[PDB]
Structure formats: structure tokens, C-alpha cells
Point group: C2
Chain length 238, copies 2
């Protein structure tokens, strides 16, 4: 029925997901559909992330890669935002307002050849990883529980997702309330505590201006919204 | 130890609350406290609400009551924002940057004599209502389950709270993760669904500009942040 990150989402799947109320279905059959998917938008694909940069100097908006290609953000911090962009679904171009998978983005010149390989791994936190035994699609979380990636790197991707609608379901392709995420084994309370009560390890992202470390949630709120796009933008200088 | 809405909050109470990790406690004996309460701020008192107004005309920021006293917001919508303010803990003065209980606000001239009685009831969704038989402090939720208030009015206050840190615990005086709120009988999934999938019913609040109905979450994102205060402000005109 509705459009998810990659795959379409069934109306049943969302009601089971604790997203839509049993009544709103009896209202779709004998009702609209462009408004329902408009009321439950943040779950289908998610809310805005740090789409681009906006430097006070020229008053222009820029993608993340373009700004590092011209010296306004060191290659280092560029990777983080472009990873958190991948881990939520799509790479973004504020100028044109495009949202696209790593492969498309690379064709369109929105991301470097040097970054492409890493941005192709952080996107598996969207479409799923693979189980060494069984070859079955498992969650980023289940991938941390089987030791296929560092808890610092994995944790950094989970907060990018939680700060833009909730943790994603690999199989169903959409955002999920924290409780359902717990029921389906894709997150837990031990992890919520690490974000609510951050430490010096969980300071994954770096703020260019104030030059300090913080969480996606924290950095994201340091951003300004755009009117014709809505995409949150990180203000910079020089 | 930490400061809550009204009452102080024990370090045990927060760990039980699924808020602080068991390690951060043993790390309170070993070097801070002004930073811990700075990492878990949104729960202690909460995030910003719609504190005031900002009219494009004069470029000034105003409290909600002052704007209706000069004609820039009809008495009707004034009540909504001043109720949602009460139901989150404190009434707000963007100009001076004060946060205060209804009683103090009324002395200070931030709210009218006509509104005082209603703003004194919506604050019970903060400090608790009273159970007829046994006269014990019950949750706003429990007050809805015993028919002491309309589900439309009660629902409108729960979304004001959820959009600013989470539902509040009357007894403990702080915000709570949705799952704990469920465990303690202060919310449920049947209610999350009404917010995630909102209707013409759960549209409680009115936007003066676009002139339409929406949820606190939606209206709040239509707001701009302030630099010296951080309080979200609702932009208007005339």
C-alpha cells in the first residue's frame, strides 16, 4: 500500500507495528490515501536529517560532499554526516532537493569515489546485514550482538536513526516505535540508556563551529530548517 | 539529588526509570553532577514548548498573554497554548526568560485573572489529580480511565507532554520513556496510535498563520528557536 524506505508497506504491517489504529483502516476502505501517508510520514521514510551545510559567508546551501571539495569541512567530519545520511535511507542534495541511494548518488556526483565503499556498508543498517550462518537478513542491532561491527560505529548509526523517526526495520522497511523495536529484537533498554545518558565514547559527531563532540540529536538541533525544502541545514563559516 | 519539575529526583529513581545507566552512578562518586543533569535535562524538566510569539512586524518576542491583550491572538487560541504550558510544568516569559508555576505567573502579570482557574487544573497533569475514594494522587491517564475529564481535553494535554520529553510522572516529578510509562500505568499503546495516526479529533491546536488544526508536535515544528533563550517561538503578523 504505502511507500517505505525501499519496499512498499502493507496496511496490516503498520497496524501490527502499533502505528495505525484499527479504525483508520476501515476508513481507508470506505473513506483518503495521500493524507494517511501524510499523517504517518515520519515512519514511512523518516524526518529530516542533516541534509547539507549553509555558510553565513555566501548565504548558499551546500551538500556535504561539495563543501569538503571546496574546503569548509574536513574530510573527517564529512564521512560522519554522509554515513548518518546513508543509515537513514538516502543521500541528500539540498540545492536540488534530491533523496537517493548510495549508488544513484555516486552517479550524480553527490559523493566521492573514495567514500562510496563505506557509504555502501552504513546503508545495510537500512536494508540489513547478512548472517554468517543461515545467510539471513539480520538487524544492525543483531549485527552488534554477533560481533560483526564495533559498538562505537554501530551505536553512532542507531542514534542517527532514532533522531529521525525511530530505529528502522530491515525486513519491513520503515520506522518503529521503541517498544515494537524491543518486541522484535531490534533494540533494547540498555541502549536507550546510552543515548539518554550519553558519555564520552558516545560523542560520535563533531560540530565544526563550536568545535566539540555530541550526539546526532544534539547536533541536529544545532541546525536551521529551510523553507522551500524543509531539510535541516548545519550553519558554518569561511 | 537532581531537580525535577517540582520535587527533587533521587539517583535510584532515575536508574529504575530506565534513564541513567548503572555505571553512571558509580561514576558520580568519581569525577560530576552539573553535567550529568545536563546530559539528562530533557527528562528532569523537559524540552522547550511554545513559550511565546514573535511577530514579523515589530521583530519583538512576546509571551502568549501579552499578545492577546494587544490583539495578535484571539482569546481562544491563547488558552490552548497557556494550557499546554501548564501541563508541561511552567508558564513562560520569553522576554525575561522566566519559567514559573501558575500561582507565581499570575502575581507577575504573565496570565490573566480570567484564565487562572483553568490553568490551575491543567497543572494537575503535572502534580496529580485526586482519586475520589482513597483520595490518592493518580495520573492524568488514570483520571481519563475513571471519567474525571473529557478524552479530548485530556488527549490534548498528553500530546503537549509527549512532544516535550515524554509523559510526566505525578509522583516522581520527571519525564518517562514511553515503555516505563506503560509499565507504571500512565499511558498505553492505544494512545500512542491516536497521536502517530492523528485525526480531525486529535487536532486540538490552531495555527494562526495558515489557519488550520494540528497536534502540538506539528504546531511546535512550525516554530523558530531563539538564540539567547532557546525557547521555541510561534511566528505571527499584524
Amino acid at each position: 500500500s504505502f511507500q517505505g524506505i525501499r519496499q512498499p508497506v502493507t496496511v496490516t504491517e503498520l497496524v501490527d507495528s502499533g502505528i495505525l489504529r484499527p479504525s483508520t483502516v476501515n476508513e481507508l476502505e470506505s473513506g483518503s490515501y495521500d493524507e494517511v501517508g501524510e499523517r504517518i510520514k515520519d515512519f514511512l521514510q523518516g524526518s529530516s536529517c542533516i541534509a547539507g551545510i549553509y555558510n553565513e559567508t555566501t548565504k548558499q546551501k551546500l551538500g556535504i560532499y561539495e563543501a569538503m571539495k571546496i574546503g569548509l569541512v574536513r574530510p573527517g567530519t564529512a564521512l560522519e554526516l554522509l554515513e548518518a545520511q546513508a543509515a537513514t535511507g538516502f543521500i541528500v542534495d539540498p540545492v536540488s532537493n534530491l533523496r537517493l541511494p548510495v549508488e544513484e548518488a555516486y552517479k550524480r556526483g553527490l559523493v566521492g569515489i573514495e567514500f562510496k565503499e563505506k557509504l555502501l556498508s552504513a546503508e545495510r543498517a537500512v536494508t540489513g546485514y547478512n548472517d554468517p550462518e543461515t545467510g539471513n537478513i539480520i538487524s544492525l542491532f543483531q549485527a552488534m550482538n554477533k560481533e560483526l561491527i564495533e559498538k562505537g560505529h554501530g551505536i553512532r548509526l542507531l542514534e542517527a536513526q532514532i533522531a529521525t523517526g525511530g530505529i528502522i526495520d530491515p525486513k519491513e522497511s520503515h520506522r518503529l516505535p521503541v517498544d515494537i523495536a524491543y518486541k522484535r529484537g531490534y533494540f533494547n533498554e540498555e541502549l536507550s540508556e546510552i543515548l539518554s545518558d550519553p558519555s564520552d565514547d558516545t560523542k560520535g559527531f563533531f560540530d565544526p563551529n563550536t568545535e566539540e563532540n555530541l550526539t546526532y540529536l544534539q547536533l541536529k538541533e544545532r541546525c536551521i530548517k529551510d523553507e522551500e525544502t524543509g531539510l535541516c541545514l548545519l550553519p558554518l563559516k569561511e
